[PDB]
Design a protein around this ligand. Structure first.
Ligand SMILES: Cc1cc2nc3c(=O)[nH]c(=O)nc-3n(C[C@H](O)[C@H](O)[C@H](O)COP(=O)(O)OP(=O)(O)OC[C@H]3O[C@@H](n4cnc5c(N)ncnc54)[C@H](O)[C@@H]3O)c2cc1C
Ligand SMILES: Cc1cc2nc3c(=O)[nH]c(=O)nc-3n(C[C@H](O)[C@H](O)[C@H](O)COP(=O)(O)OP(=O)(O)OC[C@H]3O[C@@H](n4cnc5c(N)ncnc54)[C@H](O)[C@@H]3O)c2cc1C
Lengths: 271, 271
């Protein structure tokens, strides 16, 4: 069996988010997965990066810089116990599910703090090995999101704008940057206005998808080989690559739109 | 005699972010501004939403729903006073400056939670009063952001992709949604690789800009008058507007790209 980690960011057992977490765990276990969860609220997880994330002496206590100090602590085994426990969950996991309600067009603060304290340099990323060469290359991640607003609001013509744009900083910036293959997000729009029978089927749909989740085609991101990955070239797209794209009508992705048309549902549907 | 609020999200008084906050306060005060600060770390601000944000019995404790419960607490005066104190800072402020290091392509968790606990419904937004009809329509907000990554990384051809996409969920989804006119963000790229002399100039340029900050043209967002703002129409773009926009080369904004070219630096430069 593969290993699954479910990171849940919701404080209520009675929420649809909790129900989705239970549905996921149940479905995966039946298919032979070992399932571990991170119920951040139940954990009362400390969401705030600080010098307390490092046990014992710092390298430069008078001028504390979290990136350098947290990296050093990781290498020397001096990270805070709660951080280390989470990192071990990540290392064991093949599939990571992030279950959360959309909050101010992003992840809840407690989940954002989880990323900030757990995704430490060298462990989760290096400038030498980033995006598709990232440490989590063998792992797959998926966002399971619930929203208050309807799907129409997040359509191209909706008042909020394209949901693909909202998803990008998370799926590309956080997950893919660390090497994750990112699967199509499970989007549950206006769950507060969804009829009872329909909420039941959404749960069943989620269970059914997870039966074959590992064999899905992941979302498309621009491969890192298209870029000159060094400070001298400023991590810019290769000259020959740019030349080849000048005849193309569509951009490569949401973030790499190149001033052209973004491919439809680049962050919502796989090729 | 206008009033400014500076929200800072950095743990270290020795940081450049703190220096930017200090420079902003002094520059504004010299021009006669009243300046109030929210140093979230120094305030030990709690960024995690919970039932205890309501200082009394809940309307529906068996099924706790934060949006409805927090709005009810707001109207009845049963919001936690640490939230109330922040809300009063916002009421008095004409200009709001958010000073923070870019962290995982968004705001630090402590600031995210600040938005989540303080921007309560009715106080900060309603489905009737949203975007340009929002409660903060008379106010202006600006992001002052420092990054570890270079500006080229966030260019159209950069490995991280377009920064305008990264800014959208914050500037449109959080700030503009509540009514704020959003001014051009102060972007300070690769501050960790900036020589001492250039760091001095960055501080001065920030001070110089703030001398006439209120006279600046705000960023462009699609006007809400272009949309049918009701649930029956799903808050979609008006039929006449859609047909008219079909003849426009560029999308309206980052989020309202409409599957077309995004206007250059829509979230970075004013028209
Ligand atoms: C601070 C904040 C910011 C927000 N920002 C945004 C935003 O930017 N955009 C946006 O769209 N929304 C936003 N929201 C709204 C938020 O996304 C929704 O309130 C949330 O997604 C609702 O999910 P829930 O899990 O709380 O469901 P709940 O509202 O708790 O439950 C929904 C329904 O599911 C039912 N249910 C529960 N368990 C089961 C089960 N086992 N089987 C069947 N039915 C069940 C419940 O009875 C309920 O009727 C925000 C909310 C907050 C508090
Ligand atoms: C969890 C996390 C996630 C991150 N995610 C991202 C990301 O997604 N993208 C990205 O690009 N970056 C990211 N970063 C990097 C981050 O954006 C930078 O570390 C941050 O912007 C640096 O700001 P600072 O104020 O800490 O600078 P500091 O490192 O504190 O200061 C830089 C220099 O300024 C000098 N200085 C301080 N005060 C003064 C003064 N008064 N006058 C002159 N000089 C002074 C200091 O001596 C120091 O040498 C992340 C960092 C963390 C910790």
């Amino acid at each position: 069996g593969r290993r699954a980690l479910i990171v849940l960011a919701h404080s209520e057992r009675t929420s649809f988010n909790y129900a989705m977490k239970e549905a996921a765990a149940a479905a995966l276990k039946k298919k032979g997965w070992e399932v571990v969860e991170s119920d951040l609220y139940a954990m009362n997880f400390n969401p705030i990066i600080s010098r307390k994330d490092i046990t014992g002496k710092l390298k430069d206590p008078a001028n504390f810089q979290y990136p350098a100090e947290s990296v050093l602590a990781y290498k020397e085994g001096h990270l805070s116990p709660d951080i280390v426990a989470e990192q071990k969950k990540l290392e064991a996991a093949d599939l990571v599910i992030f279950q959360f309600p959309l909050q101010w067009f992003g992840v809840p603060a407690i989940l954002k703090g989880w990323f900030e304290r757990v995704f430490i340099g060298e462990f989760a990323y290096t400038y030498a090995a980033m995006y598709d060469k990232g440490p989590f290359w063998s792992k797959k991640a998926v966002l399971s999101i619930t929203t208050g607003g309807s799907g129409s609001m997040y359509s191209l013509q909706g008042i909020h704008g394209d949901m693909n744009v909202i998803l990008w900083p998370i799926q590309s910036g956080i997950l893919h940057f660390c090497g994750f293959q990112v699967l199509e997000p499970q989007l549950t729009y206006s769950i507060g206005h969804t009829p009872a029978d329909a909420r039941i089927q959404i749960l069943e749909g989620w269970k059914k998808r997870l039966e074959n989740i590992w064999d899905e085609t992941p979302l498309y991101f621009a491969p890192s080989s298209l870029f000159d990955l060094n400070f001298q070239a400023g991590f810019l797209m290769k000259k020959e690559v740019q030349d080849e794209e000048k005849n193309k009508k569509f951009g490569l992705s949401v973030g790499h739109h190149l001033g052209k048309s973004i491919p439809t549902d680049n962050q919502i549907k796989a090729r």
